[PDB]
């Protein structure tokens, strides 16, 4: 017989025909999948009295456990079974209710923000419901669904109940972001934005996808704070960190201004004792809202290569050593310019200074390399100034060795961040980056948490899915949609710190990047490692930046340029194509295909709604949802594996069946040059920076050791091609 416990408590006999019908439905259109295999593996686990939901997890998991490269379509079988289950958990049926009734009920329960029903009429929700296609839920892969269920869909944390499905999330994110639009265009923007996200053309951060439509206004996940050389600024910085990390934001901290150990008695304060005890204080600030002090809370801290304490700073992440000499749970970015590299090449010395002993040096380091050179050599000669000489090879070696040990000592080329930048360095220099080394924005130290004259940089992020577009001219519409949606969010979200609001309202900075780059190269028959992708990349990133700029330009005409537009190089009619590292000419010869001179005059005249538009971030969550390769990165392998309380989650790279030979896996790359040449080419067009990795397979090298000579050449290659930052260093194990 076999009996089943229904949702409530009642019992009826098992329906093997019903299970079979759902599986048949799930398997429609798929290839190389066995319904009977799934049936065999799950039915053997059933027992008399099994509850209904438990039959569902079992069949889902049975399908999920057969996901492999030879049968990739089990991703889709398991996904659809999971979707079905979730429809029932949410709606008690497979058909979702009308959009209006759904929203009404959610407002009643306190799960959706009630502004939605104020901003739109029943007629308008009826209309929005005609835009929706719930069948697009059928396009998710299994790992996509586990991501939706884990962190996107509105749900009860305690009880486990799920309250919505993916298309409702998509339509209502759209409805919220365009809610202030004139009735004449509002619903057209909504439909078009909904189509773009629901067909994966545009990807959005988790805070946005989980929160927009709900009563929260906390959507800032990327913040940059610069610390001044004073206890008041140290305290303010610390306080701003605590405030933001409680909202799960990643932090970039610039702390290179703090005077070195031993420095003169500041008529009260206590900077005799050095940078490190304050770094420790920034760490506990970053960690103040983390489960047991570990999981959650992330920051990267920045300082110049020539800081008097640099040798102590470089080894903060090192395991062995006295606990007072270590600050292990933050990453670091070492700031470098052309002169520091020159001393290395010429086998000369580098002079270390405390920023407090060298008037103007810190400022010039970022803003003006000629003044840096003048002031630097001058101070090297003044024997009245406290200083320390080190061999450049020893300083670089130490840095590169620590970069290698931890993978988490990063690099920022501060000259490149200011010579090739949307900002005039005399007014608004870029003096740091963020957690992930793609964000590059101006900052100003705070007096006090509430100092109205400080500036904390914020950035709103998104990405174009390069694999979901048939051609580059689709980017025109996608850029309009993305820029408008993100710009609206700036007015919508909250600002817990006055100085952060200043940055956001002043500059209105966006950071739009890409996902599925690897897949896109593969299906165009190119590779990372051999230079074959160079011209295609040039062409691709021109299109992105041109269309991004055009959308923002058009938005400025309609709504007004950003308050502080006059501080951009854009205001002076200067474009990315004017200021890029000239060496790029030797590695690509793709012509510009778009009319940049027309755009130039249109920018001089009407300005930009946004001071920045582009940044190339890493992705994991949003690329898993699209079944996209992550960011600009080559996949480590054809099948991705993740652990969960629900079983092993597998995801196969898109179109493995037809592309397995076209892909170039991370470790198939003979070396770093081809990838770095692509990063350099992208950077020609990108406003901010790129989360560029370097990679090293010990087994490619004599006696299994990566030579320092190679580590340094790649560093110089990065610089020579104008790469602004270097993020994670990946060393393969085994």
């Amino acid at each position: 017989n076999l009996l089943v416990t229904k949702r409530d408590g009642s019992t009826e006999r098992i329906n093997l025909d019903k299970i079979h019908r759902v599986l048949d439905w799930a398997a429609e259109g798929l290839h190389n999948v066995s319904i009977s295999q799934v049936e065999l593996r799950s039915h053997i686990q059933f027992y008399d009295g099994i509850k209904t939901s438990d039959i569902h997890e079992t069949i889902i998991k049975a399908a999920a456990d057969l996901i492999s490269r030879d049968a990739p379509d089990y991703q889709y079988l398991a996904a659809r079974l999971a979707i079905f289950h979730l429809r029932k958990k949410a709606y008690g049926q497979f058909e979702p209710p009308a959009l209006y009734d759904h929203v009404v009920k959610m407002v009643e329960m306190g799960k959706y923000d009630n502004h939605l029903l104020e901003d739109y009429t029943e007629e308008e929700f009826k209309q929005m419901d005609t835009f929706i296609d719930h069948d697009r839920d059928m396009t998710f892969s299994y790992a996509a669904v586990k991501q939706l269920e884990g962190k996107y869909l509105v749900q009860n944390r305690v009880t486990g109940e799920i309250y919505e499905s993916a298309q409702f999330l998509y339509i209502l994110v759209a409805a919220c972001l365009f809610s202030n639009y004139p009735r004449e265009t509002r619903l057209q923007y909504v439909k078009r934005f909904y189509d773009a996200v629901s067909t994966f053309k545009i990807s959005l951060p988790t805070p946005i996808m989980s929160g927009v439509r709900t009563p929260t206004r906390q959507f800032s996940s990327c913040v940059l704070i610069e610390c001044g050389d004073s206890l008041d600024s140290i305290n303010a910085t610390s306080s701003a960190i605590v405030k933001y990390v409680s909202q799960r934001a990643g932090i970039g901290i610039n702390a290179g201004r703090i005077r070195a150990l031993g420095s003169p008695i500041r008529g009260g304060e206590a900077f005799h004792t050095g940078c490190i005890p304050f770094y420790k204080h920034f760490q506990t600030a970053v960690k103040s809202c983390s489960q047991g002090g570990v999981r959650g809370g992330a920051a990267t801290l920045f300082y110049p290569m020539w800081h008097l304490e640099v040798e102590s700073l470089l080894v903060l992440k090192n395991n062995r050593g006295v606990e007072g000499n270590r600050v292990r749970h933050m990453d670091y970015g070492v700031q470098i310019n052309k002169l520091m590299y020159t001393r290395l090449l010429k086998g000369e010395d580098i002079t270390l200074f405390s920023p407090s002993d060298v008037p103007g040096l810190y400022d010039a380091f970022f803003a003006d390399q000629e003044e840096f050179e003048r002031l630097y050599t001058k101070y090297e000669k003044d024997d009245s100034i406290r200083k320390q000489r080190v061999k450049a090879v020893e300083l670089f070696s130490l840095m590169m060795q620590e970069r290698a040990s931890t993978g988490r000592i990063y690099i920022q080329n501060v000259d490149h961040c200011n010579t090739h930048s949307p900002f005039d360095p005399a007014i608004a220099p870029v003096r740091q980056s963020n957690l992930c080394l793609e964000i590059a924005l101006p900052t100003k130290p705070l007096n006090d948490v509430n100092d109205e004259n400080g500036e904390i940089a914020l950035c709103t992020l998104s990405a174009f899915n390069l694999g979901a577009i048939n051609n580059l001219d689709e980017l025109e519409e996608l850029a309009i949609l993305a820029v408008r949606a993100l710009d609206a969010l700036l007015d919508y979200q909250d600002y817990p710190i006055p100085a952060a609001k200043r940055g956001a309202m002043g500059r209105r900075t966006l950071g739009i990047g890409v996902i599925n780059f690897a897949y896109y190269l593969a299906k165009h028959g190119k590779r990372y490692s051999d230079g074959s992708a160079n011209n295609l990349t040039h062409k691709t990133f021109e299109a992105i930046q041109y269309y991004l700029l055009k959308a923002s330009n058009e938005l400025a005409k309609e709504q007004g340029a950003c308050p502080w537009f006059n501080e951009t190089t854009y205001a002076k009619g200067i474009l990315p194509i004017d200021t890029y590292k000239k060496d790029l000419d030797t590695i690509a010869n793709e012509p510009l295909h778009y009319d940049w001179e027309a755009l130039r005059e249109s920018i001089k005249t009407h300005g930009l709604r946004n001071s920045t538009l582009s940044a190339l971030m890493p992705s994991e969550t949003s690329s898993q949802i699209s079944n996209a390769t992550n960011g600009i990165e080559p996949p480590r392998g054809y099948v991705s594996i993740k652990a969960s309380k629900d079983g092993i989650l597998r995801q196969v790279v898109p179109d493995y069946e037809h592309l397995h030979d076209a892909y170039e896996l991370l470790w198939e790359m003979p070396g770093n040059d081809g990838y770095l040449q692509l990063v350099g080419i992208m950077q020609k067009f990108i406003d901010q920076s790129i989360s560029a990795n370097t990679n090293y397979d010990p087994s490619r090298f004599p006696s299994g050791k990566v030579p320092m000579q190679q580590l340094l050449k790649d560093l110089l290659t990065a610089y020579k091609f104008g790469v602004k930052t270097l993020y994670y260093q990946n060393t393969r194990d085994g």
């Binding site: 090449l345 050791k705 320092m708 610089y719 020579k720």
Partner: peptide, 16 residues
């Protein structure tokens, strides 16, 4: 894991 010896001669050639 890493080999720390550096040839300064071979580096000096490079063009920033």
């Amino acid at each position: 894991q890493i080999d720390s010896e550096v040839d300064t001669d071979d580096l000096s050639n490079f063009q920033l």
